[PDB]
Structures are given as C-alpha cells and as structure tokens.
Amino acid sequence: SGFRKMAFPSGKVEGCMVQVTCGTTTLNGLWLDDVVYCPRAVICTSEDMLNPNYEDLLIRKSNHNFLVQAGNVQLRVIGHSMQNCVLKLKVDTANPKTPKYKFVRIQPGQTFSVLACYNGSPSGVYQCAMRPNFTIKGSFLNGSCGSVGFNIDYDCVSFCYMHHMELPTGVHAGTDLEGNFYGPFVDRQTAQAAGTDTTITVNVLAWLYAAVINGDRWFLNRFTTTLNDFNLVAMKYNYEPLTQDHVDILGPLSAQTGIAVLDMCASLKELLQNGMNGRTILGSALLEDEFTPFDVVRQCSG
Amino acid sequence: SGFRKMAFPSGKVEGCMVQVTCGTTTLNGLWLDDVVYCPRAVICTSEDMLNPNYEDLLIRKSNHNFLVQAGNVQLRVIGHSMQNCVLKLKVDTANPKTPKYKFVRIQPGQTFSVLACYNGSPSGVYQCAMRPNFTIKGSFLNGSCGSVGFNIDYDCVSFCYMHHMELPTGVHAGTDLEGNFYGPFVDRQTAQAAGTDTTITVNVLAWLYAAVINGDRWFLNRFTTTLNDFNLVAMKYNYEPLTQDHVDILGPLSAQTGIAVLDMCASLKELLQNGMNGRTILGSALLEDEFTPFDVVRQCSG
Amino acid sequence: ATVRLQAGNA
Amino acid sequence: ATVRLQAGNA
C-alpha cells in the first residue's frame, strides 16, 4: 500500500555522468560508448549568451579546448560536432558502464526521472512530468545544465531529456538527446515564455484510481456522465479534453477497481465544481496530474 | 529554482541489493563486505507468521537452507546468526561494490531515501520522513521486505532503515540495520497500531522558508509571536512544540531570507487558523512537513 | 486487521 | 526577465 512520487533507480545513469569544461564554463555530459553528449551552451562565455552564434563559436574551438573528466580520469576528446542544441564529443575511451539505452522523445503528459547533477556529480533524483506546454517543473540550480531525464524498461535506459535552462517563471526547458528543444524555446538568455499550461486529465483520473486502490473513496458518487458532457466541464477548469484513447488506456485500472471511467469522470466533475471541502486524496489537497496510468499500475497492487 | 521531493542517487545502494530465499519465502538482502543483512522474517512460512519463535525456527536451519543470489551469481552462505530482528548471513565473497558506509539510527522527523526492491531487484526510489510515531508513509508491496532507507554524505552511505511490514492503516514499519525496530512494533502478523501522530513543526517552517527562497510570500505578515504563544497554537492543531534548538537550526534559512523565525512562526499561526483560502505553496494546498532544514538548504539556492 | 510481513513467494 | 542557461563556473 501507499502511493509516492517514485523515480527509477538512478545507478545506470550515474555511471554515465561526466563533467565537460570549455574555458571557464562547466556543465554535465552524458558518456555513452565513446561519445559524450552535452549542451552546446558549454562553448559560451557570459557575454556570448545573449545572442550566441553557435556555429561561429564552435569553429573557433579545437578538440583540446574540451576538458572531459569522469571521476578522477580525464578523457581525451578526439572529435567534436554539433547536432542541433547538443555537442557530440568523441572520446578515446568507451564507457565500460554504458547501459543498454535508447534516445526517445517523450510526449507532453508523460513522466520521467531526473538525475540532478553538478560538475558531473549526481546530487539527487526526482520524478517529473512533461507539461502540456513542454516545460517541466523541476528543481535545478546553476551547474545543472546537462543533467538528463530518463525512464528504464527492463534494463534499457530510454533517455528523453537533457536540461538546458530555467525560464523567468521558475520552470525548466531542455531538449531531447538529439538536441531538439521541447517546446518553442531556444538556448540563449533572452526573454522567452511558455504557452499557457493545462491540467493532464487522464493523469488525474489515473491518480483517482490509485486512491481507490489505496482506500480513498469518499469522492466517489452514484452518478455517471458522457464524454462530451465531461469535456464541457474540463474546458471550464482548464483541463485537457478526454478522448476515447484515454478511456481505453484507463481500461485496466477501471477493471481492477470496478469503477467505470465515465463514472470516475463524474467523480472528477464534482471535485472540480465542489473542491475538496477540507479533505485529502492520497495525502494531497489538490488534484495531482503528474502520474500516468502506467505509473499507477507499476506502483499499485494488482 | 523549484522545489521537489528529491532522493539521493541510489547507485551505491543498488550495488548492494541481493535476493535471499529460505524455503518458499523470498525477500531482499543488503550485501556489504562478506555479510548479507536481511529481515529474520525470511525463515517464516505463512503459518509461522502469527506467533513465530524465531530462535526456534533458526536453530532448525543450516547455512545451506539460505539461497542468496546476486544478479546471476549464487553466493555461498558460510555462517549465519540473528541479531535482534535481522539475520547476518556470512557469505564466501566480499561485495566488490561495497561503498563506504555506516549503520545509523535516525530520529523521528528526519528524512531518508528508500530504494524499493523486489526479488533483490531495485524498482524505485523515493524520499520518506520518519514520522513522530516511528512509522513511515512509504510505498511497498509484497516482496519489498528487506528494502533499505539511507542518506548519503559525501561518498558514505548511512543506512538507517530496513523495511519489514505494513500496518493495517497502510503505513510501514521497520528496523535500523542492527535489527532494532523503530517504534513499539514486532515482526509478527498480529494486530498492532501506531501511537497518534503529530506534524513536524520545524520541518513545516523549513518548507515555508524554501517557498520564500522560491518566491511564494503571500503567506507572510507584519506580525510576530513568542515561542510560548506559538506553541499554544501548535498544541491546538496537533503540531509538535517548537524549541530554541529548532529556532537555532532554522538560523541559516532565517538569515538567508531576512525573515525572523518567530516572524515565520506568526505566518504559520495564521495559516493554521485561516487555512489557505484556495492558494498553494510550492505547489501544495497543505502544509508540508517531510522536508528538514538540511533538505531545504541542500536543494535551494544559497 | 493484522500487520502484514511483506516478504514474497519464491 | 530573461532565460538563464544553467551552466556553472569552472
């Protein structure tokens, strides 16, 4: 029993974290086989960062301008190239700790584990969702650039996020591992803002199922609703429209609990209209939307 | 910026997790140097668990009754003994991945990372507080017995918790690593209940400081209060009394933010009396008490 | 209700 | 206000 924001065990990723330094700028890199991946912002000085021309800055660098350190060992860079917003630094040593891995791009609404890192040294692990507006509500300080986000399936690490920057609202933006940003952002220190965000409806419903599996059922009711009628309420409260595919993905949880999805939708409708009246659900006083159906099934009893 | 429930990187502990099987019972063990530590409940069958006599059950076992598996490798048990509620299984191989470590017992109100495990295989990591009533609000299913909780300081793992069991209320109980239970519990499947819990006041105040460091300051006010007058309100709302030592530990955070502790106490008093009126603090609609002052300082900007 | 010792089945 | 690229100082 119990329900916690749970991250994947970080060990396989810890073995891949290195430090990359160019000039007086340092950040984290990801060392897989004989390549170190890192944000191209590492070739920027403070003055470059307002309006960097990265191809210009890069052509003025040589391999030996890149100091890569893995623990006590300096790695010799033997080649470098830029792919979108990341650098690929070819090194002369293949990482003996390289896990089975994939570079995947995730969808808004999906979750992943973040290994926060500083100077190539892992400092903490926590779970994040990709927000509908392609930001993440992370916990990152200066030096965190290059920390990665990932999921683990069997023994394969699917890397999905490399951290770059913090927006003025305090939220975070980054790229997939081929250096393509999530959302309409660029790696320069300019005024940028995210689109308006929305709440991830299918995830809230998954979390309501988790609560029932865990014995919170005060919010249930005898009512039902149609998909169309629920989506009318969702738009009022800035929730995402619910689709038949979301109803389908919720199938297993609805079968485990005996609560029809549209019945749980009616429960959610009342919560949105009434609030909670001083009660809690799985220890929260608000509707949690950063657990996917998969997260719920993975963690909850069958 | 940002504030998340952050666990320690779990890699050093992942390298220590093994599976221990005795008969048809299996659970997790912790392999350090040439010793595997695990809950003594592993020598129990279903029928033994209501009223086990563990010294009796143990004397009927030999070394070869204990199957210890580390990944693909079976470890040969060459000695066994019981210390309080854990077993120490001496094996013929020292764990080459043994980190620097300590066995520490923690205090109620302190936090630690849990590596949830099943069949010796790590499955997730999350942060927990030891509740004032010596339970933890964890996330554990059958097979989790023997999962450990820990903190990491520099490169030394201070193990503080081994998981044993779940109480009827859905909360969790276990031992330190010399097998002494936290709280008034025993390792048998009987009706047991925890003492009444209370909220960890110093931690709530630490979390309020985190919020100010992160720009939530709507809850501040021009008022102050005395320690004695605050503790009067705390007792009404089932919060722990605040001491001068807690005020002292909050010193660094109060100096960083310019908000006197007793001024923050007055802010907390109003929150307790007024509720939040539909606002949130660091993304929560209730007062969070599972972050210590140390957790706040570690994670927040200086 | 009773405490559950959360071992697993081999 | 502007975006902050969160690299560190060597």
Q: Name beta bridge partners: B81.
A: B88
Per the DSSP assignment, residues forming a β-bridge with A149 are A114, A161
Q: Up-side HSE of residue A103: CA atoms within 13 Å toward CB?
A: 10
Q: Resolution in Å, one decimal, please.
A: 1.8
AA identity, residue A266: A
Q: Which amino acid would we find at residue A183?
A: G
Report yes or no: A17 and B9 within 8 Å, Cβ to Cβ: no
Q: Which residue, B209, B208, B204, B213, is CA-closest to B238? A: B204
Q: Choosing among D2, D5, D9, which should be mutated to test the A contact, i.e. which has the most A CBs within 10 A? A: D5
Sign of CA dihedral B153, B178, B87, B47: negative
Q: Do the strands A25-32 and A73-75 form a parallel or antiparallel pair, or are they unpaired?
A: unpaired
Tell me the longest C-alpha to C-alpha distance in chain A: 69
Query: What is the distance, to the nearest Å, from the Cα of residue A175 to the centroid of all Cα atoms in its chain?
Result: 10
Around B215, how many Cα atoms within 13 Å sit in the side-chain half-sphere?
Answer: 7
- Asked if residues B151 and B158 have their Cβ atoms less than 8 Å apart, the reply is yes
Using alpha carbons, list the distances in angstroms from residue A55 to A25, A52, A81, A82, A85: 17, 9, 10, 8, 11
For residues A189 and D7, give the distance between their C-alpha atoms in angstroms, rounded to a whole number: 12
B227-236 and B261-274 are packed helices; what angle lies between their axes, rounded to 10 degrees? 30
For chain C, what is the largest distance between any 2 Cα atoms, rounded to a whole number of angstroms?
25
Is the Cβ–Cβ distance between B42 and B20 less than 8 Å?
yes
Q: DSSP class of residue B213?
A: H
Asked if C2's CB is within 8 angstroms of B165's CB, the reply is no
Beta strands (DSSP E) in chain B are 17-22, 25-32, 35-39, 67-70, 73-75, 77-83, 86-91, 100-103, 111-118, 121-129, 148-153, 156-166, 172-175
Decide: residue B107, CB within 10 A, 0-12 exposed, 13-18 middle, 19+ buried: exposed
- Bridging pattern class, strands B100-103 and B67-70: unpaired
| 3-state helix/strand/coil string of A157-199 | EEEEEEEEEECCCCCEEEECCCCCECCCCCCCCCCCCCCCCCE
- Interface with C, mutate which of B166, B172, B182, B185 (most C CBs under 10 A): B166
H or E element in which residue A110 lies: none
Quick one: CA dihedral A268, A270, A276, A280, positive or negative?
Answer: negative
DSSP bridge partners of B163: B174
The Cα–Cα gap between B42 and C7 comes to 7
- Decide if C3 and B23 are in contact by the 8 Å CB cutoff: no
**B35, amino acid identity:** V
Encode A53-103 in three state secondary structure. Answer: CHHHHHHCCCHHHCEEEECCEEECEEEEEEECCEEEEEECCCCCCCCEEEE
> Across the strands, what pairs with A126?
A114
The DSSP element (H or E) to which B72 belongs, if any, is none
Name every chain A residue with its beta carbon within 8 A of the beta carbon of B299: 124, 139
Q: What would the 3-class secondary structure string for A195-249 be?
A: CCCCECHHHHHHHHHHHHHCCCCCCCCCCCCCHHHHHHHHHHCCECCCCHHHHHH
Q: How far apart are the C-alpha atoms of A129 and B154, rounded to whole Å?
A: 29
CA angle A57, A62, A64 (to 5 degrees): 130
On whether any CB of chain D is under 8 Å from the CB of A21, the answer is yes
**Angle at which helices A261-274 and A227-236 pack, to 10 degrees?**
30
Among the listed residues B38, B12, B26, the one whose alpha carbon sits nearest the alpha carbon of residue B99: B12
- CA dihedral for B281, B283, B284, B287, sign (positive or negative): negative
* B188 touches B50 (CB < 8 A): yes
- Long-range pairs for B224-230 at CB < 8 Å and ≥24 separation? B224/B260, B224/B262, B224/B263, B224/B265, B224/B266, B225/B262, B225/B265, B225/B266, B225/B269, B226/B262, B227/B262, B227/B265, B230/B262, B230/B265, B230/B266, B230/B268, B230/B269
Contact with chain C for residue B26, Cβ under 8 A: yes
Which of left, alpha, beta for B179 (phi over 0: left; psi -120 to 50: alpha)?
left
Percentages of chain B per state (helix, strand, coil), in multiples of 5: 25, 30, 45
Burial (CB count within 10 angstroms: exposed 0-12, middle 13-18, buried 19+), residue A47: exposed
Residues in chain A: 302
- Helix count and strand count (H, E) for chain B: 8, 13
**Partners of residue A159 on adjacent β-strands:** A103, A150
A-chain residues near B285 (CB < 8 A): 284-286
Closest approach of chain B CAs to the CA of C5, in angstroms? 4
Phi/psi for A102 (5° steps) reads -140, 150
B53 close to B187: Cβ distance less than 8 angstroms: no
* DSSP secondary structure code for residue B63 in this structure: G
* Parallel/antiparallel/unpaired status of strands A156-166 and A100-103: parallel
Q: Is the dihedral of CA A261, A262, A268, A272 positive or negative?
A: positive
User: Number of Cβ pairs closer than 8 Å across A and D?
Assistant: 72
B184 close to B135: Cβ distance less than 8 angstroms: no
Q: Are A13 and A123 in contact (CB under 8 A)?
A: no
User: In whole angstroms, how far apart are CA A256 and each of A2, A267, A301?
Assistant: 17, 17, 10
Copy the structure tokens of residue A283. Answer: 């220890």
Residues C6, B191: C-beta atoms closer than 8 Å? no
The 8-class DSSP code of residue A49 comes to G
Residue A8 is classified by DSSP as P
Cβ atoms A124, B127 nearer than 8 A: no
Question: Of A298, C1, A286, nearest to B171 (Cα)?
Answer: C1
CA distance B19 to D8: 41
Coil, helix or strand at residue B223: coil
Q: Which residue has the tokens 């003994």?
A: B81
The DSSP output letter for B227 is H
DSSP string, B139-204: ---TT-TT-EEEEEETTEEEEEEEEEEE-TTS-EEEE-TTSPBSSS--SSSS---PPPP-B-HHHH
> Do B159 and C2 meet the contact criterion of CB atoms below 8 Å apart?
no
Residues forming beta bridges with residue A74, ordered by sequence position: A69
Task: Please report residues of A whose CB lies closer than 8 A to that of B125.
Answer: 6-10, 125
Among A170, A121, A126, CA closest to A146: A121
Identify the chains in contact with D, defined as 3+ C-beta pairs within 8 A: A
Domain A201-299, CATH homologous superfamily name and number: main proteinase (3clpro) structure, domain 3 (1.10.1840.10)
Q: Which of B109, B121, D7, B30 is nearest to A28 (CA)?
A: D7
C-alpha span between B76 and B252 (Å, rounded) = 51
Q: How far is CA B88 from the centre of its chain?
A: 22
d(CA B301, CA B212): 11
Q: How far apart, in Å, are the Cα atoms of A110 and each of A105, A113, A149, B16?
A: 10, 11, 12, 31
Residue A175 amino acid letter: T
Method: X-ray
A188 to chain D: which residues are within 8 Å by CB? 3, 5
- Asked whether the beta carbons of B174 and B163 are under 8 A apart, the reply is yes
Q: Which residues of B touch C7 (CB under 8 A)?
A: 25-27, 39, 41-42, 44, 142-143, 145-146
Residue of B nearest to A153 (CA): B123
List the structure tokens of B203. 């931690």
Residue A175 forms contact with D (CB below 8 Å): no
Q: Which two tokens stand for residue B283?
A: 């993304």
CA distance A136 to A169: 11
Q: Which helix (H) or strand (E) holds B136?
A: none
Task: Tell me whether residues A163 and D3 touch, CB distance under 8 A.
Answer: no
From A4, A6, A11, residue closest to B15, measured CB to CB? A11
User: Rounded to an integer, what distance in angstroms lies between the CA atom of residue A65 and that of residue A60?
Assistant: 10
Which residue, among A72, C5, D8, A10, has the nearest Cα to B143 in the 3D structure?
Answer: C5
Contact in structure between A139 and B6 (CB atoms under 8 Å): yes
Q: Cα A153 to the chain's mean position, in Å?
A: 16
What one-letter code names the amino acid at A268?
Answer: L
Top CATH class of B11-91 equals mainly beta
d(CA A135, CA B258): 31
The burial class, CB within 10 Å (0-12 / 13-18 / 19+), for B288 is buried
* Phi/psi at B263 (5° precision): -65, -45
Burial-class residue B224 by CB neighbours within 10 Å (0-12, 13-18, 19+). middle
Quote the CA–CA distance of B145 and C7 in Å, as a whole number: 5
Strand partners, B162: B175
Contact of A39 with A187, CB cutoff 8 Å: yes
